[PDB]
């Protein structure tokens, strides 16, 4: 028998268009450019889920550097001291402690300095 | 082996011995499936056609010159990508019937009959006593034999009064022993077969 | 319609029991002064169609049993 084109085409295309909500102009309206932009969005999001981890480690390191220089220390020497002292607190936690509790961070700096001298 | 023979009033009129080579085999489901598929395919008429680019009316001339107009090159207004053009491939009239070895056909018939035997779907009656066609009488007879809705009635030869009386009842089908086929037996929930028809079936199918 | 046997091929090979094709040898028509004695003697002996050639020509002789 004959299979007419039917409704499946419209359903698939409408899915893509709904995924393109908020895009500029024709990119939220026309199926072809919307499909291209949604593909681009998937590829970008895959790349950026990996890049996000780099970005946030970088932010924590910058903050830890600022906090350590407030105690006459560089980031690299502070991390060397913490490693030699056996302290396993990661960079997110160290930056959060430096922001939240200055005194606890000062004690951590004392431990790192002691392990180096 | 031993099957009860009933009267149309529902009483035990005797007993019959039906061979285990026809009603007592283990059903072969692969062969039975193939037989059912074969019979359903043989029922297909296969009358379906479309017009390819040669069969569509007109379309002799080249629509425009090959080069220079800026249009896509075209050869006939009846090409498949044209609206109203010829169909590429599509249905063409053909038969769907095919054949299987005779031994497989016999094994399929035996398997269907044996499946009826195992599932308590075999009812043997002494004889049908219908001098004049009357659908109401056959309906009451099926009521008295505690039969389900889908019933296949098997007589030895062409019984005109039985066929006339059971013809209009939905879910009831009538055939002869020679006319037994896998679709008819498989569709039925129960088999109502006379003693003589059972003997003839046992003889023909061994 | 039925496939057609390659009649030229059919005139040059025979099927063996295992399904291989026995063939005659090229270079056996003339110019025998230019081939050595041993060459001609050994060119009298039949060969088989090679497997690489069989892969190419099997359908041409599907009916020649």
């Amino acid at each position: 028998p004959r299979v007419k084109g039917g409704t499946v085409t419209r359903a698939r295309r409408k899915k893509t268009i709904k995924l393109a909500k908020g895009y500029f102009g024709s990119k939220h309206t026309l199926y072809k450019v919307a499909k291209q932009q949604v593909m681009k969005s998937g590829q970008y999001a895959f790349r950026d889920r990996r890049q996000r981890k780099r970005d946030f480690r970088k932010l924590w390191i910058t903050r830890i550097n600022a906090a350590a220089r407030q105690h006459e220390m560089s980031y690299s020497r502070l991390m060397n001291g913490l490693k030699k002292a056996g302290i396993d607190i990661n960079r997110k936690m160290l930056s959060e402690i430096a922001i939240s509790d200055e005194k606890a961070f000062a004690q951590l700096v004392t431990k790192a300095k002691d392990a180096l001298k | 082996a031993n099957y009860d023979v009933l009267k149309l009033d529902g009483t035990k009129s005797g007993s019959i011995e039906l061979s285990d080579a026809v009603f007592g085999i283990e059903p072969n489901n692969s062969v039975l499936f193939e037989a059912i598929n074969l019979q359903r395919a043989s029922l297909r008429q296969g009358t379906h056609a479309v017009k390819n680019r040669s069969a569509v009316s007109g379309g002799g001339r080249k629509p425009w010159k090959q080069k220079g107009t800026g249009r896509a090159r075209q050869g006939t207004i009846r090409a498949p990508q044209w609206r109203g053009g010829g169909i590429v491939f599509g249905p063409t009239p053909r038969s769907y019937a095919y054949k299987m070895p005779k031994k497989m056909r016999r094994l399929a018939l035996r398997s269907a009959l044996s499946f009826k035997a195992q599932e308590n779907g075999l009812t043997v009656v002494d004889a049908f006593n219908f001098e004049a066609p009357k659908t109401k009488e056959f309906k009451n007879v099926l009521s008295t034999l505690e039969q389900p809705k889908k019933v296949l009635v098997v007589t030895e030869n062409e019984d005109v009064n039985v066929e006339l009386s059971a013809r209009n009842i939905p879910g009831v089908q009538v055939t002869t022993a020679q006319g037994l086929n896998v679709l008819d037996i498989t569709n039925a929930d129960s088999l109502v077969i006379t003693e003589a028809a059972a003997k003839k079936v046992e003889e023909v199918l061994g | 319609p039925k496939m057609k046997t390659h009649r030229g091929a059919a005139k040059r090979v025979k099927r063996t029991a295992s399904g291989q094709l026995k063939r005659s040898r090229a270079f056996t028509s003339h110019l025998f002064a230019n081939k050595s004695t041993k060459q001609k003697r050994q060119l009298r002996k039949a060969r088989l169609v090679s497997k690489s050639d069989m892969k190419r020509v099997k359908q041409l002789l599907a009916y020649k049993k």
Partner: protein
């Protein structure tokens, strides 16, 4: 088995491959044909046995022999196939045909010597191999040429 519960035997059915229906199938676009050339074309490809213009194999090889118009081919029965008859049987082409030993009689029946004959028989056949006659007579039987 019910018509609403049909089941093909395992491994007896397989879905056909449809090419040119999208990239994910692996046969979309070029549809398994690769790219360009003669073999990529509709109706494309050289005839079987064509070697691109190199002289083909069945032209570089010579023709050989002839066909005998009067070629006689015999139906053959070996000794091991005569072992199905009872001792003292008189074997005849009619009996061999009736017993299923010989389907097509052809130019005549010939008895060959493969297998062991452990039953005394009387055999009437058009031809006998030497070992067939020796083994039929050795087992106490007799043979005749008809």
């Amino acid at each position: 088995m019910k018509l609403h519960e049909l089941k093909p035997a395992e491994g007896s059915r397989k879905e056909r491959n449809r090419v040119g229906r999208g990239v994910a199938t692996g046969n979309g676009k070029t549809s398994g044909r690769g790219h360009k050339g003669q073999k990529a074309r509709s109706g494309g490809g050289v005839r079987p046995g064509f070697e691109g213009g190199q002289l083909p194999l069945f032209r570089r090889l010579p023709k050989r022999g002839f066909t005998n118009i009067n070629r006689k081919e015999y139906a053959i029965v070996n000794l091991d196939q005569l072992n199905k008859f009872e001792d003292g049987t008189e074997v005849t082409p009619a009996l061999l045909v009736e017993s299923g030993v010989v389907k097509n009689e052809k130019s005549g029946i010939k008895i060959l010597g493969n297998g062991s004959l452990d039953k005394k028989l009387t055999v009437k056949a058009h031809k006998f191999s030497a070992s067939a006659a020796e083994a039929i007579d050795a087992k106490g039987g007799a043979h005749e040429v008809i």
